[PDB]
């Protein structure tokens, strides 16, 4: 019964790609904010479900903020996805390999890949993998917020939006969570 549509619940990285996301996904509902974590995205997801605002396809674009609890957080948000939805997980990317949290973000991305592989109503959008392939969008940056000027911000934002668009196309023929 859940009506068609896409809502993205995302973090500052997603918020940085706001215009590119909307351009690549016309009519998608982009709900991205600076401090969003996987924890609060879980709460936002259910709040929207319980008010019947959550459409069929849910994009969770979080993971780089507060990565330490990734196991429980991604287990939980996957568990709490309401019946009737398909879910897309956007893997996080921390580019500074010396960051004390780099290995955690990497573990989080890997664990999200495991959940998407495992779960029929879940699809991966592997920003982590794509981000590693494009060093040019990280020159002069904090290694998380793509682009040091307009051209690489735009190029980075378009790569980010296209990754999610490709996952949505992949998820088109795939089932929803049911019972
Ligand atoms: Na899957």
Numbering used by the authors: 427 to 605
Paper text:
One such target is the enzyme O-acetyltransferase A (OatA). This extracellular enzyme modifies the essential bacterial cell wall component peptidoglycan and thereby makes it resistant to the lytic action of lysozyme, our first line of defense against invading pathogens. It uses a catalytic triad of Ser-His-Asp to transfer acetyl groups specifically to the C-6 hydroxyl group of muramoyl residues within peptidoglycan. The overall structure of SpOatAC adopts an atypical α/β hydrolase fold, where the core parallel β-sheet contains five strands (β1 - β5) sandwiched between seven α-helices (α1–α7) forming a shallow and solvent exposed putative active site pocket.
Unequivocal identification of Ser438 in SpOatAC as the catalytic nucleophile was made using the mechanism-based, irreversible inhibitor of Ser esterases methanesulfonyl fluoride (MSF). SpOatAC treated with this reagent lacked detectable catalytic activity and X-ray crystallographic analysis of a native crystal soaked with MSF revealed the formation of a covalent adduct to Ser438 (described further below). To confirm the identification of the catalytic nucleophile and gain further insight into the enzyme’s mechanism of action, we determined the structure of MSF-inactivated SpOatAC (SpOatAC-MeS) at 2.1 Å resolution following modification of the native enzyme in cyrstallo with MSF. The MeS group is seen to form a covalent bond to the Oδ of Ser438 in a tetrahedral configuration and it is well defined in the electron density map. The overall structures of SpOatAC and SpOatAC-MeS are very similar (Cα RMSD: 0.327 Å over 178 residues), but several side chain displacements were observed in the active site on MeS binding. The most significant structural change involved the side chain of Asn491. The presence of the MeS adduct opens the active site, shifting the Nδ2 of Asn491 2 Å from its initial position away from Ser438 and displacing the water molecule w1. Other minor displacements occur in Ser438, Ser461, and His571 as a consequence of the steric effects imposed by the bound MeS. The methyl group of the MeS adduct appears to face the solvent adjacent to Val460, and the sulfonyl O2 (the structural mimic of an attacking water for hydrolytic activity; labeled O11 in the coordinate file) forms a weak H-bond (3.3 Å) to the imidazolium group of His571 while protruding into a hydrophobic pocket formed by Val490 and Val570.
